[model samples]
Target: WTVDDIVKGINSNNLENQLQATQAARKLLSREKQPPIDHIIRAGLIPKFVSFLGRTDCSPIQFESAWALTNIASGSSEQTKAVVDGGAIPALISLLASPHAHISEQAVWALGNIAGDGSVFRDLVIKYGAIDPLLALLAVPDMSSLAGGYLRNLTWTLSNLCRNKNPAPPLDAVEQILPTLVRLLHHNDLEVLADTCWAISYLTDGPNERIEMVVKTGVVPHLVKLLGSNELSIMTPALRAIGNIVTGTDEQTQIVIDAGALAVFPSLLVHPKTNIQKEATWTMSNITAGRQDQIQQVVNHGLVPILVSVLSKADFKTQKEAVWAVTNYTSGGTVEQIVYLVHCGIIEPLMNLLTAKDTKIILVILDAISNIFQAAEKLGETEKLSIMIEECGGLDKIEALQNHENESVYKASLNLIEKYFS
Candidate 1:
């Protein structure tokens, strides 16, 4: 009748079939109609489910309950927060610590979504000792089996927690952990490897030293190989992982460039799906963000024109990020780079963005464009500045922005306007 009724069923020893009921219920708890499941979980049903997660005779029940926990956590912030508050982490660690494969995985799935809630809280992931169990899963021979999906979710959880937003995982632990995950690059499943590669970058967390450590892991080329995979799901995130690691330094830049990451980026420009194009462009932007000289490397590979060309048609995020890449960091020497960005007709879209609903993101665009306008002014190219800004309500809104809500945007607006105002 209620959650109390269900727990009474389990506490009364109905748990003999509880796994069957739980697994079947896992399939139902998150569906078009989720209220009954929601209420039961909200009422403390999780700890009871967690109780059954480890006993060998009840392993089936334990596994289903774990699955149910993950579904409830993934379904909403309130559900996830409730599970976190209910002490799910220690029990999950118990499962990860056990020799049972299904138990380790269900716990990993719950932790990944639950840990995603906060930067500091994600550290709770390590409390469960997820890294080793997940790595153990990857070491198995036939990876794409159900264990592989579970392992994929496991690695994904660890890496999400490893990101800078989380409390910050230890570097020493990372050194011990990455090698095991990296071995999966050669695994039989491209799908598993795709998410693994994305997760790995987060594990490395963009430290120049950590990034170098990742290069030592030799994960880049395997991801490049996936661009050729016909499966878009894998291909999309694979490209995102590629975008994550590249930066200004020569050795790393050369690695991405030589590995053909640059060549791979712009081709997604015209992908029929906006998701593919937006993600590809975001990846492209991150890769090129500070490495201006490398812009020519992509340009030489013919990525220049269309990379710029997508500006007008792109959504606010794509437009903002792409213009930042072309106009700020990578714009340089021969004049063609700036010429190409201008050719992209980026001005109208950028001016249109000054009015975006998200004030902070709009400031980013304004700051980038202001910086570019200043660069042109330093070159004594008033003609170019005048042409781009006169009709677009230039230089002033860029100056008038101190009144804006976000201090970062206000300051950026001043620097942007005065940089060219003379």
Candidate 2:
């Protein structure tokens, strides 16, 4: 039928016409050579499907309408705005409370798309009253009262909503749902677990206070368990959440360690996937940066050699994390720890960083190199490291940077020259 016929069917007095129109539109969107649904949309059928959401009498049409709107939203952002600007969100939000599980499922997916599209679409989902119903699915008062299928979509939607904001919709709303969120970690459903991990990743990705909020939910121990999953999909977000948690206070970092993060961290560092390795290295970097005791835990865990290998041979992002870990070790480790770092096969890799073009990495490498020299100097072991540096050609490298444009690198390189070589 033509676009005119479809519009007429959607707005007809007969319920079968309305259903047929929605089903036809839904089917049309899937075909390779279809008519322009944009024409159907401009005919003002979006508001009709939106109104169908609130009607209790026509369940099938409502599903088809929501399904059609979902496909409409699946298009470009401007297309999704047709649904958003057509005032579908509030109606869709109301359908989330529907007794029909399929209705709730369709609405959940529709809202999931809108929220994940951008901040404006995301805030529209949040402000239109989606969070409470979604949160309820996560912590159903009676477990069997909600279908597992619905809960999966609900948590997945929550993950999408959390994907936008820096603080992930602030801690106030999050704090209320924190307990349920942590409880979902033990869920047998992998989708729920993965989405929950991502949600926590976004939530803890903010300030210290927000990180503290997630920690308060007692999630670290549970999160650490997922690191051992054979599923890389689950392990990646699990690592991300743990990485953000360590960015909290020294106590928070220790809490992650106390939860057995240290046990599995070395394995995570050597993950086959570079992205996982990157996040694991970031976690190691933060843990090494935590406190003297934590730094020693990393050193004792035999991460030093692994970190040195990563710095020397891994991709640039991993190298950055490895160098950051080295930076913290120099800043926080005991004097003997500093001495051990130089002896732990890092001196050569540290020397090689001089060839790096970024002044920031240069300064990081130089600052740690300076600290290494200063640490040995106080112990009157300067000549030993001085010879090591000369053997590795570190002196010549620093001399080349003597007139470097960045004042800090120049000054730092000069200070190393004065203290060790002069």
Candidate 3:
């Protein structure tokens, strides 16, 4: 008649009654809106349901119990903790290897909910040796009719495992998942590819050593190929993985460049999706932040004009990265490269940003202007560049910045005007 009566049935000694009652409990929890998670927890059935996971003799009970717990864990962080407090993680992980595909898939779903709740529970799932069995499921050859659904849930769970980091997911455990991630990067399903790329992206988002761990797997070529994907979901993480790889050492950044990532930049820099454009520009900033030859590769790829274009036109967030790409080149480029950038119509944008509200943007713009002036002095062309700055209203803007709020920007602007403007 009620949920309590159902709990009483779940507590029965008779096998049929217990199975039916568990099914009823799962149904109640499965409601699309306002599932009675609190009522069920108050009914004191979490441990009972957890114990049912080990009931291999009755796969239905195990399946229903896992499904019910999955829904419960999906409720809220506190609710997920309730399941964990009932000792459900190890029980659910054990079901990862269940002979029954439905049961194992349900277990993976449940663990995903728990791990998705937060980093501590994710560590708990991994601490109990969830990675090996999870990978083993992926390693199965010629999976049955249920393969697609199982793979989707498995890869999604894997992505959650690799997500979030103040203390990053354990590198040793992360290392264990690399080969599988490399393999999955080539999977045909879009969902699988998206999650796989996200996992790779997360794994590489740290120190140079961590980026190298991912790069060493021969994943660079595959990641480069995915950059051309029309689907935003796949392309985004693919771009992120490539972006992270570029943040490594010059030689490491060179790996991505050498893989022909530059070939895709032309289109991505102008893509309609602002987020993609932002990532593409951010990646370029890192590339330009490298050595002179690395900067040369960017110039050789014909990206400087586009970077200048983005600096003048894209959103503020993207424009900030674009200016860095332009300024870093100015800071490091040879005189000829600086001349090439100046000819790309960079002066107008750089001059326009002189009055920008953000002090960091203004500082970099002033530094870039100084670099250009210094280059001109070296080449005995200071008079010609001086006219270019004056023509763009840059002199007026720089002089106006003399009394700016930020000390560093005001100092840099004043130094530029005194040394060059006079």
Candidate 4:
């Protein structure tokens, strides 16, 4: 009803009613209908709403505003930018220690969304002690025996908050964040474990030796155990972290393989989902890239046929990553295996995989094509470019990748462009 009705409901501890009113107000503010949210955030809420934050009696309105603020900051870019510019960091910092668990959860999400932007992270993620309360949450043991789902979501959200790859925030940023991230990998819940692995993946990034810190904490063995899980959600990201470790870079790949990871990889080829197959194949290729012994073992282990079967039957991502994996393994001493794949005349399939439902598959397809082109060039045949045109279909599909309204297929169209070369 009226704003006074809303305040009265909150004051009377009509908590559910307050929640209902707040949700109704927020719906009018969601991004699907952007302008209204922008108006509320930019104009600011009534001062009475701010008064609810410290009142233990009116905790519902505190949480309602907390939730509303998160949506407001997230829904509109200018408002997001404006909140940071207004310096709401102190208010956010105060709430992190609030006794209201519901309000605190929204506070964490709000603080995180704010921190992802430079203006906020610059002032808060490093300066305010966001980590201590977060660290306290991390140490609250055995949520499963207690209320594990709540603890797991809390940990997982905190873990994702660090995904920013922007210019460095502070040296302490990593020092403070990494331990809790690494610790969550030991979480028994598969949901927490998957996201923990993702957070670790984001933190350990490029130079894989960075993973040595996490490995020292024994996060790897837990990750490897999850690799055997039947569910793809748990296993795919686990294998992704494994790939990043055992096969991704020169340093960490060796560490993962030496830790005895090869035994776990081949099982993923039969996985029902494409992501698991892709990450597993990618890891296999990486593990064997330099070591011919590993290559022979993988081929003899029947990885080749399984991979070809995936390339022949699975969806777009499966083919893209599987082909990329084969491309890596088949590079130098393993060229014979490449011949086995080529004998199937996989070129048309390669072309079509690029044109599959989503265009994200194209980057890997192009890499695979480049490698195949190199292999075919060595064989004294350069004619397959014609087949890309003949079998897989052409220019119409390039429309998917065009950031512009115009289309350019980089195939028949590239040559055709020369016709107007003047």
Predicted model with the maximum TM-score: 3
- Estimated TM-score per prediction? 0.63, 0.91, 0.96, 0.65
For candidate 1, lDDT tens digit of each residue in 328-353? 44344334565555555666666666
Candidate 4 lDDT score at position 327: 60
Question: What's the lDDT of the predicted structure labeled candidate 3?
Answer: 0.88
Comparing 1 and 4 on lDDT, the stronger one: 1
Q: How should the candidates be ordered by TM-score, best one leading? A: 3, 2, 4, 1
Over 4 Å off in model 2, which ranges? 32-35, 138-149, 166-168, 402-411
Q: Could you give me the TM-score of model 3 versus the true structure?
A: 0.96
Global lDDT of model 2: 0.83
Question: Residues 1-422, candidate 3, lDDT per residue (tens digit)?
Answer: 36887788988988899889988888887754787788889988999999999998999999999988888888788898899999999998899898988888888888888888888999999999899999998886653343677888988999899888877888888889899888887788898899999989998899998898898888999999999988999999999999999999888898999999998999999999999999999999989888888888888889988888888889888988888888888898899889988998999988887777888888888888889889999999998888999998989898888885678878988788888878
lDDT of each: 0.65, 0.83, 0.88, 0.59
lDDT at residue 62 of model 4 (Cα atoms): 66
Shift of residue 408 alpha carbon in model 1, Å? 17
**What is residue 413's positional error in candidate 4, in angstroms?**
23
Which 10-residue span in candidate 1 carries the lowest summed lDDT?
Answer: 326-335
Better of 1 and 2 by TM-score: 2
Per-residue alpha-carbon lDDT of model 4 for 1-422, expressed as tens digits?
44444445545555677566665555455535544654454344533344444455766666766666666666556866655555455566667677766666666666777665543454465576766676665565554453565566566556645565555334455556677766666667777777777776665554444556555556676677778777676777777778777644555555575565666766687666666777776677666575666566666666676777777787665666676666666564345655556665555566556555443456445545555555666675546544443445532343344443323335433333232111
Q: Write the per-residue lDDT of candidate 2 for residues 1-422, one digit (tens) a residue.
A: 56677888987988888888888888877663554768868899899888877778989988988888888887878788888988889988888888887887898888998888887788778877788887764555765466777777877787777677643564566776677778777778788888899989988888899889889888988899988999877898999999999988999999999898887977777778899889999889999887888988888888888888888888888998999989988988889999888778888888887878888999899888878877887798889988988898878998888885778878988888887888
The residue-level lDDT of candidate 2 at 207 comes to: 85
